[PDB]
From a paper:
The nuclear hormone receptor PPARγ is one of the three peroxisome proliferator-activated receptors (i.e., PPARγ/α/δ), that have been exploited as drug targets for combating multiple diseases, in particular metabolic syndrome-related disorders and cancer. Activation of the PPARs by natural ligands or by synthetic PPAR agonizts triggers the formation of heterodimers with members of the retinoid X receptor (RXR) family. Upon recruitment of specific cofactors, these heterodimers transactivate PPAR-responsive elements (PPREs) of target genes involved in insulin signaling, lipid and glucose metabolism, immune response, as well as cell cycle and differentiation. In order to proactively evaluate the deep interactome learning framework for protein structure-based drug design, potential new ligands targeting the binding site of the human peroxisome proliferator-activated receptor (PPAR) subtype gamma are generated.
To test the practical applicability and usefulness of the structure-based molecular design algorithm, the two top-scoring de novo generated designs (1 and 2) were chosen for chemical synthesis and subsequent biological characterization. Compound 1 exhibited the desired and predicted dual activity on PPARγ and PPARδ at half maximal effective concentration EC50(PPARγ) = 1.5 ± 0.2 μM, and EC50(PPARδ) = 0.24 ± 0.05 μM, respectively. Moreover, compound 1 was characterized for its affinity to the ligand binding domain of PPARγ by isothermal titration calorimetry (ITC), yielding a measured dissociation constant of KD=  0.8 ± 0.1 μM, and a molar ratio of one ligand per protein molecule. To investigate the binding pose of compound 1, X-ray structure determination of the ligand-protein complex with PPARγ was conducted (SI10). Compound 1 was bound to one of two protein molecules in the asymmetric unit. Compound 1 bound in the orthosteric site lined by helices H3 and H11. The buried propionic acid head group is engaged in four intermolecular hydrogen bridges. Three of them are established with the side chains of Tyr473, His323, and Ser289, whereas the fourth one is a water-mediated hydrogen bond with residue His449. In the empty PPARγ site, the carboxyl C-terminus of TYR477 is blocking the site by binding in a similar position as the propionic acid head of the ligand. The ligand’s tail moiety is exposed to the solvent, and the propylene glycol-like linker allows the ligand to enter the hydrophobic part of the binding pocket, where the two aromatic ring systems engage in additional interactions with the protein.
Numbering used by the authors: 203 to 264, 275 to 477
């Protein structure tokens, strides 16, 4: 904030953080407080096997077991899409873009955002579910029958490496906006207005990380590099769905996810 240009970058960071808080009900700071046993929040019920999953169904409240779980992740993605869409609308310039490009930017951005923010709810042993009321172990997720036995592993591998960056919600707010305003999504009609916005967002992210993580060298670059991992998670998940739909012909797909995945990659 030391000159007027950089003060406007601060104002943009604060705007996005504010909108993020308003849009996403379970923040990283709340997730971390649940996972680490802090006294601001309530310990989760832990599901690590079939009997504890049965108990959990009664305690949390919220068909083979693998399919119920897989579909539960899809319902969560649909809620996430709703929240990401409302956040996207708050990004200055987004709603003024061509409507076709608004739709394309959401279509290709929402999963990258979902896996970014999924890391906030993960550690190397498992993941928060039902808004933090439950915690499902990574080993229980690995135990599910084929073809569902490894669908969570790439997301855990990503999370453990992403979490070592030690980003907070104020950082994440800007990073998620940068993800959405990507000028290289396929089929965009007007790239230039997108990149002008993305430029501003990147400038704000960069100053946010230098202020908030003054001791953490090239954090900005190391964060942008993680956009590689996110892309690979997505393309791998799409391949897995192609497999699942051949053996599991009785599995339905929420219409929002169907539209998103159509001709995605
Ligand atoms: C009985 C039960 N019924 N539901 C249960 C349940 C268990 C675990 C859940 O979440 C674990 C973390 C979310 O992980 C993700 C999220 C999104 C995707 C991508 C999905 C797509 O968009 O295609 C993903 F692949 C994994 C959960 F929400 C519900 S237990």
């Amino acid at each position: 904030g030391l000159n007027p240009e950089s003060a406007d970058l601060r104002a943009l960071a604060k705007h996005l953080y504010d909108s993020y808080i308003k849009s996403f009900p379970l923040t990283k700071a709340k997730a971390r407080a649940i996972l680490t046993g802090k006294t601001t929040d309530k310990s989760p019920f832990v599901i690590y096997d079939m009997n504890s999953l049965m108990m959990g169904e009664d305690k949390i409240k919220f068909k083979e077991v693998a399919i119920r779980i897989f579909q539960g992740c899809q319902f969560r993605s649909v809620e996430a899409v709703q929240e990401i869409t409302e956040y996207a609308k708050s990004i200055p310039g987004f709603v003024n873009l061509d409507l076709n490009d608004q739709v394309t930017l959401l279509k290709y951005g929402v999963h990258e955002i979902i896996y970014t923010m999924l890391a906030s709810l993960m550690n190397k042993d498992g993941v928060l579910i039902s808004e933090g009321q439950g915690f499902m172990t990574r080993e229980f997720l690995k135990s599910l029958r084929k073809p569902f036995g490894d669908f969570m592993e790439p997301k855990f591998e990503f999370a453990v490496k992403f979490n070592a960056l030690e980003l907070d919600d104020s950082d994440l707010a800007i990073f998620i906006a940068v993800i959405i305003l990507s000028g290289d999504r396929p089929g965009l009609l007007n790239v230039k207005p997108i990149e002008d916005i993305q430029d501003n967002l990147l400038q704000a992210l960069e100053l946010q990380l230098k202020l908030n993580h003054p001791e953490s060298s090239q954090l900005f670059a190391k964060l942008l590099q993680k956009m590689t991992d996110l892309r690979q998670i997505v393309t791998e998940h799409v391949q897995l769905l192609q497999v699942i739909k051949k053996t599991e012909t009785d599995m339905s797909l929420h219409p929002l996810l169907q539209e998103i995945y159509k001709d995605l990659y």
